[PDB]
């Protein structure tokens, strides 16, 4: 039952939030149509993805629920997810003498030399066959360093010797230690087998007799890798003498003795290096940090682990029987040598020290044993302590730079600059320590800050963790002084603690977003956890979320708050809003579009009512109840509200909702904007709005109605309101099948001189030549309207001709006109060129996704050549340009001075044409401040040519994604 719903749950996670809402609505329709099986509507609405899948399976059944989901997927025009779902259903839906003496002698030998210095069931199953059907010949073990791999291998050999492990498979065992191989320059397997036997003589024919009888064990592959890095040809002959590394290489590659079977023990770095050698292996994962931690606690800085380790190490460093005694010179010298050996071990990724290397360093054995008690964690701490107190380029540099194990040393290095852990060091050593590493870390964090893009999420989280470890206010403030806006995902409680501490000291934080998922406590009812009442309710996570919300509320310099993608429990929203209500807050913009906050909306309106500094509020993709709209309207009417913008998207409002919105529109004085995009707005809902706008009191200055599906009756209602109104200035009606009739009604309304709106947009409105003629007739004699847009409408050449003829008299006051995807040609371009040369009021133009070709652009170049033109920005893209047109354009730009912005992307230019274009660009005459081109799209010569143009005129910026540093109003008005 669970196995089938698991796959379904994982299929639905591919759908987006809007796709999820569409899925829920389509499921509502499917349930309504059917009569055999029923589903409550409110239960479909309240459920999220996981509850949705489990509910679907509870009602329909396994196969039926899968089939329903597949059919719905197909309905939303998703075909890949349908096939993935079908496959995952296919998988998840169930179908409906001498040898004995040798082994005894080996037993005695290793028993003695191990006396000098459960899992068996799993190890016995290592070479068995799985349910797939497969018999592996090589097995590799990896895991933590605390466990003794040598001990494990030797105990395996012991169990084989007694015979309780692998009694029937093989007859010989060879144990291979790597250090001993490195001890001898020349070696061979013959010498090894002679060594192992007591008499030192063995029958070579007997040993080579059969393949299955042999087993080899290789231990500590990671201890030495420098010699193995070398490349030499593999040896086919077993008896031949070769370097030990060549023997190991041949043995692992299975070129040597291809029929035998192996087993290897390695560490994480070693398996990183080794995974490329072995063939078709079976990995086994084995899992003294706890003992070390409790021992350190016994010998006691509770805020961080670095403080605990510092306490332990400093306590150990004190002379035995004496307290806080200053170290002598020789003690300091030997400590420095020990710490250098530790850093060398860290860099070289080896944790095993031999006696000869210790002699090379020169430190004494007794003093060393006095300095250290037990571990890689202590090694990393000692390396950090070194940093507190060979070849120019080496492979160890990049190996240790992999930062899987170096992360701990970095963390401890950051945590060692704190004063609380500094004073014990100062008293212990008795000397003041100057260090420059603090400056280096500060510069590193600042360099992260000085990037032009918004700080990356993971980088920000890691930097915050480091700075939280540091625990220095002045250092943190100097470190975070650089960057102004952050992007901060949160996954665990430690994330909350670190962010809460670090974000208080960001002096110039202006914007922020937070992605919060999976943190919140399991619901107190229906999801009790035996391990987790204090953990289930009133948990520490709740207190620390409260602390995070408190610090978010109290921040003085923050202005915008965003929620990228969060799943908020009603309690989380309760506490967040409660911390946001207080008047000391200063957050001006809120955005909840992408967050899932449906259960917690009811606690939002109180901040709007009470907070005096809020100005904008955005909601989207959420479902709003009628009582929610009533509460919002009541909050807006309150005389202490100063909110200036409200956006409601895809909320699916009822008719009575629009009645209440009209009433607040006539009531609320402060509201100056309103957006209803994606909502269904029937003409019956348009009429209340028209009545509200007719009243002289209304002060709405912008109005957006996108995908609202209004008709000609709505057009005449809005036209009459416009005749009556004198406050509205901006108006948008896009993706509405208005048609020529509706455009005619609006035309008749705008014909009068007393209209006062300045910007109108109509995209995907099924316009045609006749509608463009209506607009042409209305435009003449009108002086207020300034910005007009008609994109994605089949307004042909002739309609543009009418518009151009209308606009060519100076009387006209149209500044910005942009039309995209209108099926234009060359003659239209000639008329437009005449318009540009003659007119004086037009300042912006846009021709994108039109097949102007070379002739149209040549005509336009003739148009722009005139010094009378005052065009400011020109938009060309996907216009199919080539060499000759680009030559003419280059000359035009050489001649012009007024143009500032340009765009040429998705156009095919040959290298010669680009040489001409760049030569035109570099001219002092032309001053283009923005250019649309992709640098990386062109050969090295062209790239260096563009860079040479760039270093000249340092002000110019070439960036492919147009709209860079453009006026904010143009796009901000729309949405």
């Amino acid at each position: 039952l669970t196995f089938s719903s698991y796959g379904l749950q994982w299929c639905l996670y591919e759908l987006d939030k809007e796709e999820f809402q569409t899925f829920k609505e389509l499921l509502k329709k499917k349930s309504s149509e059917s009569t055999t099986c029923s589903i409550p509507q409110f239960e479909i609405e309240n459920a999220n993805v996981e509850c949705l899948a489990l509910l679907l399976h509870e009602y329909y059944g396994a196969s039926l629920a899968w089939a329903t989901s597949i059919s719905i997927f197909e309905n939303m025009n998703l075909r890949t997810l349908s096939e993935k779902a079908r496959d995952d259903m296919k998988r998840h839906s169930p179908e409906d003498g001498d040898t004995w003496d040798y082994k005894s002698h080996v037993m005695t030998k290793f028993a003695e030399e191990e006396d000098v210095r459960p899992e068996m069931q799993t190890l016995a199953g290592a070479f068995d066959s799985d349910r797939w059907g497969f018999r592996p010949r090589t097995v590799v073990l990896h895991g933590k360093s605390g466990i003794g791999k040598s001990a494990l291998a030797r105990r395996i050999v012991l169990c084989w010797a007694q015979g309780g492990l692998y009694q029937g498979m093989f007859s010989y065992v060879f144990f291979l230690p790597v250090r001993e191989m490195q001890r001898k320059k020349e070696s061979s397997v013959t010498e090894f087998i002679s060594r192992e036997w007591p008499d030192s003589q063995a029958p070579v024919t007997e040993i080579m007799s059969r393949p299955e009888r042999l087993l080899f064990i290789i231990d500590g592959f990671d201890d030495l890798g420098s010699v193995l890095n070398n490349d030499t040809k593999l040896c086919k002959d077993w008896a031949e003498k070769q370097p030990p590394f060549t023997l190991i290489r041949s043995l692992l590659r299975k070129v040597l003795l291809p029929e035998s079977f192996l087993i290897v023990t390695v560490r994480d770095v070693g398996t990183e290096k080794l995974k490329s050698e072995v063939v078709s292996p079976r990995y086994l994962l084995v899992r003294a940090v706890g003992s070390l931690i409790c021992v350190a606690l016994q010998l006691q800085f509770n805020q961080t682990l670095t403080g605990l380790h510092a306490a332990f190490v400093f306590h150990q460093l004190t002379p035995r029987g004496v307290v806080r005694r200053c170290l002598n010179l020789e003690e300091r010298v030997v400590l420095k040598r020990f710490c250098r050996m530790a850093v060398e071990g860290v860099w070289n990724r080896k944790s095993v020290f031999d006696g000869d290397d210790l002699m090379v360093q020169g430190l004494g054995e007794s003093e060393l044993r006095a300095l250290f008690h037990m571990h890689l964690s202590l090694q990393d701490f000692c390396a950090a302590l070194y940093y507190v107190l060979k070849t120019k380029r080496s492979m160890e540099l990049k190996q240790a730079g992999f930062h899987i194990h170096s992360l701990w040393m970095k963390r401890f290095l950051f945590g060692l600059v704190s004063e609380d852990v500094r004073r014990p060091l100062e008293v212990l050593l008795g000397c003041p320590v100057p260090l420059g590493v603090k400056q280096k870390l500060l510069h590193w964090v600042s360099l992260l800050g000085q990037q032009p893009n918004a700080t990356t999420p993971g980088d920000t989280l890691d930097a915050f963790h480091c700075l939280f470890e540091t625990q220095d206010k002045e250092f943190v403030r100097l470190a975070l002084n650089s960057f102004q806006e952050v992007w901060l995902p949160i996954n665990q409680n430690l994330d909350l603690i670190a962010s809460s501490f670090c974000l208080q000291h960001c002096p110039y934080l202006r914007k922020i977003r937070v992605d919060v998922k999976g943190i919140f406590p399991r619901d107190e009812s229906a999801e009790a956890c035996p391990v987790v009442l204090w953990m289930r309710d009133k948990t520490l996570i709740e207190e620390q979320w409260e602390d995070f919300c408190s610090m978010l509320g109290t921040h003085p310099h923050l202005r915008q708050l965003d929620l990228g993608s969060s799943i908020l429990t009603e309690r989380a929203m309760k506490t967040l809003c409660a911390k946001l209500r207080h008047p000391t807050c200063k957050i001006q913009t809120l955005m909840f579009r992408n967050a899932q906050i449906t259960p917690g909306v009811q606690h939002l309106w109180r901040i709007v009512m009470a907070n005096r500094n809020l100005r904008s509020l955005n909601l989207g993709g959420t479902h709003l109840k009628e009582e929610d709209v009533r509460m919002a309207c009541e909050a807006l009417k309150h005389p202490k509200c100063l909110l200036e913008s409200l956006r409601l998207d895809c909320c699916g409002l009822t008719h009575a909702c629009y009645l209440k919105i009209s009433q607040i529109l006539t009531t609320s004085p402060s509201l100056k904007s309103l957006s209803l995009a994606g909502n269904k707005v029937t003409d019956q809902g348009v009429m209340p709005l028209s009545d509200a706008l007719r009243v002289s009191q209304c002060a709405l200055q912008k109005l957006i109605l996108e995908d609202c599906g209004i008709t000609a009756t709505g057009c005449q209602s809005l036209a009459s309101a416009l005749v009556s109104n004198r406050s509205l200035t901006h108006l948008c009606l896009s993706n509405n099948s208005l048609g020529n009739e509706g455009v005619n009604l609006l035309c008749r309304s705008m014909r009068l001189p007393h209209c006062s709106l300045q910007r109108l947009m109509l995209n995907q409105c099924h316009l045609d030549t006749a509608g463009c003629g209506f607009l042409a007739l209305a435009l003449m004699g009108n002086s207020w309207l300034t910005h007009l847009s008609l994109s994605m409408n089949p307004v042909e050449d002739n309609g543009v001709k009418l518009l151009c003829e209308v606009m060519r008299e100076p009387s006209c006051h149209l500044q910005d006109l942009e039309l995209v995807k209108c099926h234009l040609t060359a003659a239209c371009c000639e008329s437009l060129s005449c318009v540009i040369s003659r007119s004086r009021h037009l300042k912006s133009l846009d021709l994108t996704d039109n097949a102007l070709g070379d002739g149209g652009v040549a005509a336009l170049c003739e148009g722009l050549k005139q010094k009378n033109s005052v065009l400011a920005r020109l938009g060309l893209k996907a216009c199919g340009l080539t060499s000759d047109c680009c030559e003419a354009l280059s000359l035009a730009l050489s001649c012009n001075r007024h143009l500032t912005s340009l765009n040429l992307v998705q156009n095919n230019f040959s290298p010669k044409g680009m040489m001409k274009l760049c030569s035109a660009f570099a001219c002092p005459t032309s001053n283009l401040q923005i250019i649309g081109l992709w640098k990386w799209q062109y050969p090295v010569q062209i790239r260096k040519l563009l860079e040479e143009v760039q270093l000249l005129k340092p002000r110019v910026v070439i960036d492919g994604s147009w709209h860079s540093f453009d006026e904010d109003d143009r796009y901000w008005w729309k949405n």
Partner: protein, 93 residues
């Protein structure tokens, strides 16, 4: 010391920072079955490694998940929802 098989397609890097949480023994029994025969398929489809163990007392069951933290949280939530469904189903019958 516990030894477990890990598939070749799981990087060794993700093994850091596992996540742990307990449940009831019988509930785990019906979640995964007495044989634990469905763990491989769930691991492949979710791209994360599970491990189910019984406390010495025999009252609680420990589940550990390896993977990127968001996958850990997601798997935890799905298993918890299934656990609640089984608890309420036991109450219903």
């Amino acid at each position: 010391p516990q030894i477990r098989i890990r598939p070749w397609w799981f990087p060794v890097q993700e093994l850091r920072d596992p996540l742990v949480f307990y449940l009831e023994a019988w509930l785990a029994d019906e979640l995964f079955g007495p044989d634990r025969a469905i763990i491989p398929e769930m691991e492949w489809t979710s791209q994360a490694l599970l491990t189910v163990d019984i406390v010495d007392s025999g009252n609680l069951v420990e589940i550990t998940v390896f993977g990127r933290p968001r996958v850990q949280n997601r798997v935890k939530s799905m298993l918890l929802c299934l656990a609640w469904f089984h608890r309420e189903h036991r109450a219903r019958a």
